[PDB]
Amino acid sequence: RRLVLYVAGQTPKSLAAISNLRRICEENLPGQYEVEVIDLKQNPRLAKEHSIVAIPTLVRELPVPIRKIIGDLSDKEQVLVNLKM
Amino acid sequence: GIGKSPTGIQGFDELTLGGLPTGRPSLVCGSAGCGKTLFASTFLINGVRDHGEPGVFVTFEERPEDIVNNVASLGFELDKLIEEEKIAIEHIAVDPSEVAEIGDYDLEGLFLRLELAIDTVGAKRVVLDTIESLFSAFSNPAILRAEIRRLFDWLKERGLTTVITAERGDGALTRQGLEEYVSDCVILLDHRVENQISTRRLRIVKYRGTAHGTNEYPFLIDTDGFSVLPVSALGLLHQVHEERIASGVPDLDAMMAGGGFFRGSSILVSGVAGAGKSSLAAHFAAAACARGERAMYFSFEEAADQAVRNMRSLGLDLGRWRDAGLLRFMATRPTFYSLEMHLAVILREVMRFEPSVVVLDPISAFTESGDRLEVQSMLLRIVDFLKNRGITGIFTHLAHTTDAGLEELMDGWVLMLNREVNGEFNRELYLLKARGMAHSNQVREFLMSDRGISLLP
Amino acid sequence: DWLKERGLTTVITAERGDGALTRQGLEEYVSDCVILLDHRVENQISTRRLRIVKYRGTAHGTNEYPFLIDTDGFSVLPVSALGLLHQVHEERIASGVPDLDAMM
Amino acid sequence: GIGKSPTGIQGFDELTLGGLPTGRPSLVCGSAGCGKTLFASTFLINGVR
Amino acid sequence: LDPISAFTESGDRLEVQSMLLRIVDFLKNRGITGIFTHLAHTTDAGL
Amino acid sequence: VRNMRSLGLDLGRWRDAGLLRFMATRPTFYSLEMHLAVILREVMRFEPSVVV
Ligand SMILES: Nc1ncnc2c1ncn2[C@@H]1O[C@H](COP(=O)(O)OP(=O)(O)OP(=O)(O)O)[C@@H](O)[C@H]1O
Ligand SMILES: Nc1ncnc2c1ncn2[C@@H]1O[C@H](COP(=O)(O)OP(=O)(O)O)[C@@H](O)[C@H]1O
Ligand SMILES: Nc1ncnc2c1ncn2[C@@H]1O[C@H](COP(=O)(O)OP(=O)(O)O)[C@@H](O)[C@H]1O
Ligand SMILES: [Mg+2]
Ligand SMILES: [Mg+2]
Ligand SMILES: [Mg+2]
């Protein structure tokens, strides 16, 4: 149960992304998985290592098949459905 | 004036008057197989290996293995140039299967990775290959449009020389409207088939900031890579020589004042089939060889052995000079190559061998290889190259007098006639014209035998 | 990707269409080698031609080569393969006309 | 250089300088009746035999 | 081969010339004596 | 020059004194429009009495 959130800088998109992640994770459901936030600007290399293109990105690696979600996570219901199991 | 970055391709560079603009984006349009990827690859390779500018190759479709293997055959070593980091390859691939879009996204990782590569390699040149896959992957079109407009602005903003590969499409020179964006330089590559013969052409559609060539220039991809020998680069600056050359026929040599035709001149030998044009050319080559000089005999009609045993009847022992290493035979059919590769091979081997007499027999064999204009362009390029090198060119042409519009340049003209009169055939020859000297105006009948070509009294 | 990944040599058959060399955009995918086959009629005579549109990684023929399907199958005798390497012989042949033979 | 797989067709093989690339996909385009199916069939048959 | 001129209208000049050149080259490589008969109307067909 | 020197016409003398001009331009060097433009421009600039 691990989730990674790739963002770049104190951007409105990334800030809203992490805030919305907080909201969906807490109000919608319990703490089933642990979140880790990585800001790409300091480590551009990690962007290549994880093959990231469009900010912001939310990637789950718990299941064998990877799954990514691109954007700021504005739609709570869609984010929850994409992250539900 | 404006800055310009050479691309290694001498013909393209001199056509553009320096090369692509420096610090501006360039668009390379053309259907699949035209050579846009190779164009960008040699761009980067030549920039790194000749002008000391690091390069970055951002590919959106092809993997680094494919990118390296494509140019591996051309003689470049992308493995070594990356193994040394002079060119940095970034395979920026996006898979829409595991992508779900919620909210607004910016192609920030693209910029971060490209900046990381640029700082790693100290790059000054950048190539963007297959940027249409970027549009095909993501769903929102406006976001992608804005993102790469920002990307082009950012590339200009930090001042890198960028070349973009784009497909042609159906309506305009691009199918994704990258012309809207890149107008500093547009180069269209075309691959057209006519009469079953396919040729590759290059055109500079729009180059903003200075003059350039506007015609369609046929180019070739060879072991070296891109090669462009435009017909507009030929100039009439030919250093003349006051020495004379020996044809090998004493009577013909004495017929003209000075002992022979001026050295480095273009000599045409015209006549009907069986007149003896090849015999005269062989006489010229053998006479040049006997003096210790090198000679080449390009033949588009006969094999080396057949020519040998044809001339051995006339006594010219071409085997001796070929075996001692002073005479070269090619024996190449007109249809073996295209016109561009015929020109390129002739030029390359002439430069490598550095001979003193080149005999092309016959120049009329290229009649149906293409249109009259293309063959004339090839012949003019060959003649100008030989004259600039100061080599004596002996061209043999068949007669049916004016033949193909290439007599227009020849310095000397020798017509060989085999006429039927009084129920029997007689041979004759005469100098139709000999520039810069006085010569006999008699139709001297001759008779070929074992001793060679001999003019009757 | 999986076929390349386990390393098999694969040949894909695709229809032409109307706009490009393929109607389903398989050119987007396969660029290692593209071979276009055409069957064109001129003056009521129909001929079959083959062309290598794009072969990535090395040189190749670029012209349109007329080919034939016969009992053996595909047969291609390109006119670009002919070379001027002909071993000559010093013997003579008899035409059957003594006067013509002696004339030379 | 790169690997190449002969396809039995001598003319096509010598045109391609060895044949189709080995380990890579090849596309055969053409309208109905051009001979793509037969091309693939002889490819396989010659490769096996 | 009698006559090589019979193929005049079978196709364009280039195609017939290609066929004739291939035949001649094949015969010469095999070292066979080729006797081609052509009709006259001198140069006939560029072969 | 060395073709005419055989006929005795010493064009070098007049070219060197500055009364004769030679262009020596190939037909394919320019397009027709630029051939015309260059000819007109140089003729106007030099103001000669005989153009061959
Ligand atoms: N020993 C010899 N004695 C007399 N004539 C000879 C001798 N050897 C060759 N010839 C003549 O040379 C002619 C061929 O000359 P050559 O090959 O130079 O002609 P060409 O103009 O180059 O011909 P083509 O149009 O076939 O290229 C033969 O037809 C024959 O008439
Ligand atoms: N070693 C080589 N010699 C001659 N031509 C080559 C060589 N390698 C590749 N080519 C040419 O390059 C072409 C493909 O070039 P590329 O630019 O990669 O594709 P595209 O033109 O579709 O962008 C092939 O169609 C082939 O004619
Ligand atoms: N025994 C044969 N001899 C000559 N040609 C044949 C023979 N069998 C099939 N053909 C040719 O093969 C063609 C069909 O080939 P195929 O590749 O199966 O179809 P397509 O070209 O539509 O893929 C026919 O149009 C025919 O000309
Ligand atoms: Mg390409
Ligand atoms: Mg000859
Ligand atoms: Mg079929």
Numbering used by the authors:
A (entry chain S): 3 to 87
B (entry chain G): 2 to 401, 407 to 463
C (entry chain H): 154 to 257
D (entry chain H): 2 to 50
E (entry chain H): 361 to 401, 407 to 412
F (entry chain L): 309 to 360
From the paper:
Using a combination of X-ray crystallography and cryogenic electron microscopy, we find a new dodecameric fold for KaiC, in which two hexamers are held together by a coiled-coil bundle of 12 helices. This interaction is formed by the carboxy-terminal extension of KaiC and serves as an ancient regulatory moiety that is later superseded by KaiA. Our kinetic data identify the difference in the ATP-to-ADP ratio between day and night as the environmental cue that drives the clock.
Twelve KaiBRS molecules (monomeric in solution) bind to the CI domain of the KaiCRS-S413E/S414E dodecamer. The second clock protein, KaiB, binds the CI domain with the same fold-switched state in both systems. By contrast, full-length KaiCRS maintained its oligomeric state following binding of KaiBRS, which is probably due to the stabilization provided by the coiled-coil interaction. There was no interaction between neighbouring KaiBRS molecules within the complex, which suggests that there is a non-cooperative assembly of KaiBRS to KaiCRS. This result is contrary to what has been observed for KaiBCSE and KaiBCTE complexes. Our data show that the post-hydrolysis state in the CI domain is key for KaiBRS binding, whereas the phosphorylation state of KaiCRS has only a marginal effect. The interaction is controlled by the phosphorylation state in the KaiABCSE system, and its sole function is to sequester KaiASE from the activating binding site, whereas KaiB binding directly accelerates ATPase activity in the KaiBCRS system regardless of the phosphorylation state. In summary, we demonstrate that binding of KaiBRS at the CI domain in the post-hydrolysis state facilitates the hydrolysis of transiently formed ATP after dephosphorylation of KaiCRS in the CII domain. Our fluorescence experiments detected a conformational change in the CII domain following KaiBRS binding, but we did not observe major structural changes in the cryo-EM structures.
